[PDB]
């Protein structure tokens, strides 16, 4: 399977430098252009540049000529984008992507995107609090999960390790007092809860935090 693997997040002080990685596997790494695109939070897509891993040939957007440097490591099949002299305008999600035409079909492959956050604040893992209804009774029951006080973005919220998908609303995080907070709700049959365990799984890769919070009655 063709895969592009990127780290989830990276926190970097202003004026420092960061090297985003894109580990390719399952295909001939030196046969396809590796593209890099940037997306500021809430904004549109921007093309940074592309590099051919065969000979490290590059095409840069002039806007990122001195800021972004594209390299490759053919011994590990990894592409690197280095961002230097970091400012607030550099905080964005950085995607790596390739396009493969095999003589029959054309397919695109994207990494998950690396959320780069430029700030002097340190990492804070999220506090996960269960949202149980309260004793004071219908065919459905809504449970919740409060993911409070983390930095930086992002976090991933799943229910029962992904077994619960229908009836799930995960709300966009809001920044307040230099910390992020989001919430998630799930609506399950009253025969499911409180009889069966319902678990809120929260992952915060910037702090290496994985918390499984059960919604106890």
């Amino acid at each position: 399977q063709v895969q592009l693997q990127q780290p989830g997040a990276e926190l970097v002080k202003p004026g420092a430098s960061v090297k985003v990685s894109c580990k390719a596997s399952g295909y001939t790494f030196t046969n396809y252009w590796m593209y890099w695109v940037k997306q500021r939070p809430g904004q549109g897509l921007e093309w940074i540049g592309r590099i051919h891993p065969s000979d490290s040939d590059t095409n840069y957007n002039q806007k990122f000529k001195g800021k972004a440097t594209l390299t490759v490591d053919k011994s590990s099949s990894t592409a690197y984008m280095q961002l230097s002299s970091l400012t607030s305008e550099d905080s964005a999600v950085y995607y790596c992507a390739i396009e493969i035409y095999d003589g029959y079909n054309t397919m695109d492959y994207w990494g998950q995107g690396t959320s780069v956050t430029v700030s002097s604040a340190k990492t804070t893992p999220p506090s996960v609090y269960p949202l149980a209804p309260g004793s004071a009774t219908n065919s459905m029951v809504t449970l919740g999960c409060l993911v409070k006080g983390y930095f930086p973005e992002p976090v991933t919220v799943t229910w029962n390790s992904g077994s619960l998908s229908s009836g799930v609303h995960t709300f966009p995080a809001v920044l307040q007092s230099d910390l992020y907070t989001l919430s998630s709700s799930v609506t399950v049959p009253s025969s499911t809860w409180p009889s069966q365990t319902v678990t809120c799984n929260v992952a915060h890769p910037a702090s290496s935090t994985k918390v499984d919070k059960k919604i106890v009655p």
């Binding site: 695109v37 549109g44 897509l45 921007e46 093309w47 095409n59 957007n61 002039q62 806007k63 995607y95 992507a97 396009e99 079909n105 054309t106 397919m107 695109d108 994207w110 990494g111 998950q112 995107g113 506090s127 609090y129 269960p130 949202l131 149980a132 209804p133 309260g134 004071a136 809504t142 919740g144 409060l146 409070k148 229908s166 609303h169 995960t170 709300f171 966009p172 995080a173 809001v174 307040q176 907070t181 989001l182 919430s183 709700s185 609506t187």
Partner: protein, 211 residues
């Protein structure tokens, strides 16, 4: 740089019907134009290359057209799963430049919210803080008002609100409102109420708890 101009920031249609995005290039780019679909929180997904050719996995509901400067992306049999932002892009000249994006909006009948209130967990109470959470799920239109009351007294400070995008299943909206207080401030009061005001009724939907 070549400017790709997507005129409309939003396009509207009903489930099952059709919709079209337009994108105009400042200079002649031939047919070297691509279209991308991006769902909230997900990586971009290429739909069209060479103005009218589909990537593998793209259904024929997505059709691209146009040459020179004017290009159009048409979506047929639109379903709620198609809710996303759509970008045009030119790759005929350097630098490669994207469009500003166009968000698909789906029309539907009005829907009243389902309101749930949640007291501060015993776990959070050990941290010196206290948050009361109010969920407002599956309502339409998006315009809604939440009002917190502490012993009948309105409280606007310490309130954090977040709205989801249009739902990928039923095209509704959801909202989460969290009222955060200190543990001692929370323990000085008894009645905590979440009041929801929406166009689907003149009487607000009220959810409350005590202690």
């Amino acid at each position: 740089d070549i400017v790709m101009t997507q005129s409309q920031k939003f396009m509207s249609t009903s489930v099952g019907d059709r919709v079209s995005v337009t994108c105009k290039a400042s200079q002649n780019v031939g047919t070297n134009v691509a279209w991308y679909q991006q769902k909230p929180g997900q990586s971009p997904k290429a739909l069209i290359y060479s103005a009218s050719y589909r990537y593998s996995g793209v259904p024929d509901r997505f059709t691209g057209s146009g040459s020179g400067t004017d290009f159009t992306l048409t979506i047929s049999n639109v379903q709620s799963e198609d809710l996303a932002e759509y970008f045009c892009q030119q790759y005929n000249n350097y630098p490669l430049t994207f469009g500003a994006g166009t968000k698909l909006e789906l029309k539907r009948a009005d829907a009243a919210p389902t309101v749930s209130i949640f007291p501060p967990s015993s776990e959070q109470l050990t941290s010196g803080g206290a948050s009361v959470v109010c969920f407002l799920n599956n309502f339409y239109p998006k315009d809604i008002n939440v009002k917190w009351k502490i012993d009948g007294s309105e409280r606007q400070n310490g309130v954090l609100n977040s709205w989801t995008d249009q739902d990928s299943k039923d095209s509704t909206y959801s909202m989460s409102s969290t009222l955060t207080l200190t543990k001692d401030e929370y323990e000085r009061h008894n009645s905590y109420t979440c009041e929801a005001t929406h166009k689907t009724s003149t009487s607000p939907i009220v959810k409350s708890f005590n202690r």
